[PDB]
Amino acid sequence: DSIIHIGAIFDESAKKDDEVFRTAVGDLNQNEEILQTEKITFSVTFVDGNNPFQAVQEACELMNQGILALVSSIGCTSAGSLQSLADAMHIPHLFIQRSTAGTPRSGCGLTRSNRNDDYTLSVRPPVYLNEVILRVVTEYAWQKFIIFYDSEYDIRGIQEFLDKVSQQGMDVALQKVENNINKMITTLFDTMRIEELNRYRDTLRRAILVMNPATAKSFISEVVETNLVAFDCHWIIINEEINDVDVQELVRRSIGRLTIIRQTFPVPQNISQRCFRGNHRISSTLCDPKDPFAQNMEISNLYIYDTVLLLANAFHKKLQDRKWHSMASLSCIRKNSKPWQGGRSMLETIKKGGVNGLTGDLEFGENGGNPNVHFEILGTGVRKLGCWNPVTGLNGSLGVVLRVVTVLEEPFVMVSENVLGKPKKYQGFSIDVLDALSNYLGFNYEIYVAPDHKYGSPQEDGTWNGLVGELVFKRADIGISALTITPDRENVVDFTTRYMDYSVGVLLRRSIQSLQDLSKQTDIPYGTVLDSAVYQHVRMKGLNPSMYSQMWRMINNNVLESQAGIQKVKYGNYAFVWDAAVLEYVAINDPDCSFYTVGNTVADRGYGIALQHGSPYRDVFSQRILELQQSGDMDILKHKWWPKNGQC
Amino acid sequence: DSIIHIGAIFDESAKKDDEVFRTAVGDLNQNEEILQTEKITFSVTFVDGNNPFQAVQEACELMNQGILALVSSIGCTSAGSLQSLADAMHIPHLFIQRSTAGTPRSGCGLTRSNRNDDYTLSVRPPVYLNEVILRVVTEYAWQKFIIFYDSEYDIRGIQEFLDKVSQQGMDVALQKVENNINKMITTLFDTMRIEELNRYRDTLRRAILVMNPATAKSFISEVVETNLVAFDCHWIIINEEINDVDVQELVRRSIGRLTIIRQTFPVPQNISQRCFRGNHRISSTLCDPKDPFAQNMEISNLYIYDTVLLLANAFHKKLQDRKWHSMASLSCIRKNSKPWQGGRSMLETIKKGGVNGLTGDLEFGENGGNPNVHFEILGTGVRKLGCWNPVTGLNGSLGVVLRVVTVLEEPFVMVSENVLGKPKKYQGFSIDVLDALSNYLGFNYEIYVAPDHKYGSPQEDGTWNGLVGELVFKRADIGISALTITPDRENVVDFTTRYMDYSVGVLLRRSIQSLQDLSKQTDIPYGTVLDSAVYQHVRMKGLNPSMYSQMWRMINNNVLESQAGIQKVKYGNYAFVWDAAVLEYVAINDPDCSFYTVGNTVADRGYGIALQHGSPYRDVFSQRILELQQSGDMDILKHKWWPKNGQC
Structure with missing residues (x-):
């Protein structure tokens, strides 16, 4: 005989909220300390999150069944209908907000009718995205950046952040990332002239990605392939639900500096204390981080679990104090539709409840919303740079x-x-x-x-x-x-990082446009310093497995040593193979501007700094050296000696 | 005996939609050509637009009454619930969107469940604000501007426009206008340093106001008083519902150039044809533009009228062809809840209907939305600069x-x-x-x-x-x-416009900070050219009704003619009153930089260009001269000879 019956309305894509809902039910029925002699039953219904009337109709059929509380895991589309229905029937409504396809959450902006008591408890914490993103850009002292959001973000989620940055004079552009990325970057090429394009590439040096990890992965890979971003870019990705599989794929796909901000759940470290909250034992599939399911759990799964644990403890108190209120068979939109008598007392019990759970410490404030939220900050490998929570703010900073x-x-x-x-x-x-x-x-x-x-x-x-x-x-x-x-x-x-890439280039006299053009004509014979590195390098490539074979065939008579090549191209017919960067400086600082350099092979090796073996x-x-590269200062020093301004 | 019964659900602030609803009902019952022998009855209910469940519950009670169609005049908060309920009960739902407090409309973004037939017809046309605002800024060739919206706008209404302008490289900032404007401008002063502030004043030279006329009036007056904007500013106000009373108050309150874009309703010009659409006679309170109510009609009132006229014509056809479908007493959320049998045929009749009305020509496309919309373009007095509609695009452009x-x-x-x-x-x-x-x-x-x-x-x-x-x-x-x-x-x-303001200034020798400081000390005696204009001007003010009396008391001995004043301040103790602009040039181009100019009275008169009387x-x-002022080029020419750069 069941006296505890709870309701569940789920968006159809909340199959994982249902599975953890049922497993949390079984786990509490095994707990002999909480509800020692009474079992919990439930009625679960899956509904289309885009139909608020279907959500009401199926919610009324759960109320007609007779329930003590209604847990819903659905989006803001149907949250307004379920918040006002609950107030009318006095059914406690534990609302868990689901975002579409993992996109960043935005507050429902519900402006709910406050004439009546609010029977909805928001299990998930408030969306602090504008506050967290404001602290990060203030630490990094950004002044001009562009904010990307996918097709599923609700940009009212940043309507305060756009005001704060406009108070602070920053050049902040927005831009939706279409669901067709390959077309979008291709589209940008047609609209903007070559002169205009450089500003976009320069703006993307500091960008913020407010999008689900899936579009974050594709959008990072798409720009890197099209080389709109470089080793100096600094992108910030922020989203509440970003699991570690996404983190490694984002770091593997990205170049430059990348900062990731995601929600973390402060849970015990010990192996024993990972699946125990007091005397309550959790199913291994949810608390063990070495189980594949637990790693694949949605954030909504964690709040579904701690919701049921809080409901059982809210029910356990009501039985102990002997103030219980039995379920009622309630009818919606009837002549004698009457609210649940025990709803007001059940609500006050739940609202003052608190539990330790997968999410951490679950509790409710006076406004009826969960106040606990924690974000971790990752940065480039990848490592943790600090923490953020709305109470302590930002934690962890970002001559011989x-x-x-x-x-x-x-x-x-x-x-x-x-x-x-x-x-x-x-x-x-x-x-x-x-x-x-x-x-x-x-x-x-x-x-x-x-x-x-x-x-x-x-x-x-x-x-x-x-x-x-x-x-x-x-x-x-x-x-x-x-x-x-x-x-x-x-x-x-022992060498350090490369501070610049070394390429093999060719000096020409004022028609060739590449080493490929160079390696197929014989009008202009070409060579490089005999038996030197560049001599061998072009040889070794040619011998083993399509121009290095035709390059070696030619140079193999026409060779020379040291500067003679530069003069040979000057007062003769000859193309000089050598270090491209040395040649580039030669052609730039030519007193008569008689040369141009082509080539720029894929750089197998790059310039380095050598120290005696074992240097500390x-x-x-x-x-x-990495910082000067990933900050662009190398591009300041490279321009000092290799300026493309136009002296020649 | 009534066989035609229609439903109405209204947001509580839609009292004017109810009044015109009832008057449209009475007007059709007097029309003997349409529904010659059958009367139309109705059931009207007012609901809280912020409660979607109340909207459903009161809609079901209208369906239980038995209706042929449901007209709703409510916001997007409850539109989702009423669109899906109608699909379930097969009741044609003529949806009229109301925005909160007159703020610009945004599309409901409903992503409504398309699995079932869509029984909702949007009587109001689509929101083309992003398209119209894009054409205006392209005509004016703006490149850097800030977009203001009030606390009630749904900025997803510009989520495409922000992408198009970011494709086109424009510096576009957003900024919500708080409901407390006086605090907001006061707040800006604390955050930004004096050096930072000038950029905001410079950005506001081109701004777009997407807000209701009430906040448009206060926000324009607030910036002008705080002189954040000047005679060269160019602001664009766009909103669908902006009546002429607002237009005159916006022009009266604003300086510079102001462009207003509002929806217009192409209606006949003749006095006879203003209250007649074929043989149908309209109540004078709605079609007569000289009646006070008709001038105070909301845009929603016009679509409420043409909705009822379209319903009567949809009903008239169904009776004539003898295909009628009688009303049903339908029940929501019941065991045997069944859709209206005649809904599908009633829908197809309405969707293919078309009427001439206050809004103009009302009709429906294949998507079920009204395709007709027209915007007029006003500009500064105020006059019409052109038209815009989504089919023809932009119309009307903006040596002896x-x-x-x-x-x-x-x-x-x-x-x-x-x-x-x-x-x-x-x-x-x-x-x-x-x-x-x-x-x-x-x-x-x-x-x-x-x-x-x-x-x-x-x-x-x-x-x-x-x-x-x-x-x-x-x-x-x-x-x-x-x-x-x-x-x-x-x-x-005959004179033209003033091309600059003439003020009376004082030259000092390297402590006085104003004419007020000047007119209360006697350490430094002061005068201006004897019996000249400036001599009289300071006199005439002093004699009749607090410094001009103390200024005249002093100058009235210490007076001189022509340049002697400039030298007197140079090699003596004396303050020279004269034209401030002439003195200002003198102090700037002083070979020894020994002077500074104070004063700058309120300019009663300003410089002008005289022509022989009656010049064409x-x-x-x-x-x-007006254009150079309202474009800023005067501020380019004023800086040529009065540069504040710092030579002295």
Whole structure:
């Protein structure tokens, strides 16, 4: 004989809320401490969340069955109808808001009729998206950015945030991400001229993604493939429901800096205390983070569980104090439709209840809404940067001299000053990268050139020469130059991150437009320094498995050493293969502007900073090189010596 | 015996929809051509638009009464419940959307369950606000603007427009106008620094008001009083329901350029054809634009009228073809709830109906929505600039030599060049205003100075001297100088618009901060040119009814003529009263930067352009002077000679 019967109305896509609803029911019927001798029965109905009248009709049939409370897991479309019906029939309505397809939640904005008592309790906490996103952009001190939302977001969710940022003078644009992304980026190309397009690419340097993880994944991958974003972009993704499978896929798909903000549930750490809240035992499928279901649980599943646990404890108190109110068979829209007599007392019991659950500590304020909410902050691998909750706000914030061996190369390392009676000064891109590390890390340095001016080749003795050899023999601490990171060099010295990509380019005389064009004509013969790295590099590619075979066939007579190639293209018919960045500087700073550079191969290797093997600074230097890249300052220093302004 | 019974559900603030509903009922019962022998009865219910369950419950009681169709005049809050209920009971639902407090309409975004037939007909046309506002900003070629909406607008109404403008690279900010405006502008002052504030004032030069006329009136008056906007601002107000009383109050309260876009109803012009649509006679209170009620009719009142007229014609056809379907007593949420058998045929009849009404031609498309909508475009007095409708789109778009007499005055009219063997050239602010008129109007001119260098004083003979006298004797056509518009001069010559305000200022030597400070101390004695205009002007104010009395008491010994005042302040203790704009130029272009100017009285009179009495160009010249003011180009020319950059 059942005296406890609860109601459930579910949107059709809430199958997981039903499964956890039933399992929470079974778990409480096994708990002998709560409702020791009385069983809980239920009536579950699935309805179309887009039909508020269907939701009412099926809710009345549950009330006609006779229930103590109505739990609904449905969207804001039918929440207005279920909130006002509950007030009319005096049935406690534990409302769990579901967003469509995992999109970010927006407050229902219900402006519900306050003439009558509010019989609806919002189990889920308030949507603080505008508050959290405001703290993040204030910490990062953003001033111009664009906010993306998918086709399912309710932008009134940011109607306060758009006012706060407009009070603070920020250039904030919005933009819906269509359900057809490939067409959308393709569409942008037609509307905007080439001159206009750069502003969009520049704006996307700081963007905020308010969208479900699915569109977050596709939209990040789509822009990266179309190279609208670069290694300096900083995107913020915020959504309440973003599981770890999405986090790894977002980080794997994205370049640059990415900040993720999602809701977290403060739950015990111990393995024993993970499936126990006091003496209550939880089914392993929901509390064990090593079970596949628990990892695939929706956030709504957690609040469905803690709802039933709170209902049982609200029922347990009412029986103990002997103030119980039996269910009634209520009728809607009848001549004698009468409210549930015991609704008002049942409501006051539930509203003052509190439980420990999967969501954490569930409780209700005086307004009838759950006040507990916690967001974690992730950042790029990926790691936790801090916490946020609406009570504590934001938590977790978001010179020794070293021997430097160089090799002269314009514009990386050059002699800027050499006046009789003064110490030798240097300048260049490699020097500027060294100064930024010296300026931030707070180390000083003394720079000397390799005795033979060589980058370094392995000798038969087993001792390296050139710049690398100096670091082998501990004659220097750091090696700064146009040094490409090679496997051989990594064996003897330890490298940091690449601070720029090294490509093989060709110098032409004022018709060729690429190495491909270069590798198929014979009007202009071409070569590169004999037996040098670039000589071998074009050879090794040609020999083993479609231009490197036709490039090696030609160079293999037409070869030369050192600068002679630059002059050969100047006063002769010849295309010079060499480092593209060195050639690029040559063609830019040509006193007669007689050259242009093509090529720019896919960069197998890139420039690096070598330290003597086992250096304790490699890790920290790699950090600051990464930061200058992911902040764009490299693009400031690259423009100093490689300006595309138009001198030539 | 009644066989025609219709239903009505109204939001409580739809009293005017009920009154016109009943009067439309009486008007059709008098029409002997339509429903010749059968009367129409009705059941009207007023409900809270914020309670969708109350709307259903009271709708079921109307269906239980037995009705052929349900007309509802309510907001989108309860429209979802009434659209799906109608589909379930097969009751044709003529839905009229009401916005809250006259705020701009937004589409209900209902994503209504399409599994079943849609028994709801939207009597009101679709919301084309994003389309109309996009055409207006494209015509005006705006590139940076801010969009204001009141607390009642549903910004998803502009979710497409924000994407189109972001595709087009425009700097578009949004900003809700709080219901407390005085606090809001006061609040802005605290948040933003003085340097930041100018950007907001500069952005408001082009703003769009998407709000009800009430907040439009207060918000325009509030910014003008706080001088956040100036004579060059261009604001666009768009709303579907903006009656003429609002239009005149908006124009009276606003400065600058104002464009108003509102819905218009193409109705016959003739007095006879205003209250007749074929043989149908309309009550005078609704069709007569000279009746006070008809002028105070809501837009929803017009669609309530044409709804009943369409229902009667839909009923008239069904009786004539002998296909009628009698009403049924239907029950909601019952064991045997059954749909109205005759609903499907009644729906198809209504959907293919068409009537001439107050709204114009009412008809329905295949989607079940009214396709007819027309917007008019007003602009500043106020006049109609064009029309817009979604089918035709936008309609209505949005050198003889003259003798010029001048008077030398820096920096208005100055000799720029006077080299032996060349004609005399001139420069200055007054000249630049003349060149802009000569450049646009396409007239040429020859400039000569008044023989005596005088602006002009009335002689005893009755013949003016100076610059005015030349225009009296038709010796010149236009008078360009630092000429203030005086009543005496208006008597003999005709003036155009003021192209700048003339104020009385004081020159000080590097402590006084205003004429008020100036008019209360005696440490520094002060005067202005004897018996000149400024001498009299300070006198006349002092004599009749609090500083002009203390100013006249002092100057009344300390007076001087021409430049002597400037030198007196330079090499002596003395404050010089004179034209503030002439003094301002003097203090700016001081070779030793020894002066500053205070004062800037309220300008009773301002500079003007005089023409010989009865000139046919005064009107057109006044136009181009107005345009340069209301476009800001005067602020470009004023800065040429009065730059606040900081030379001194």
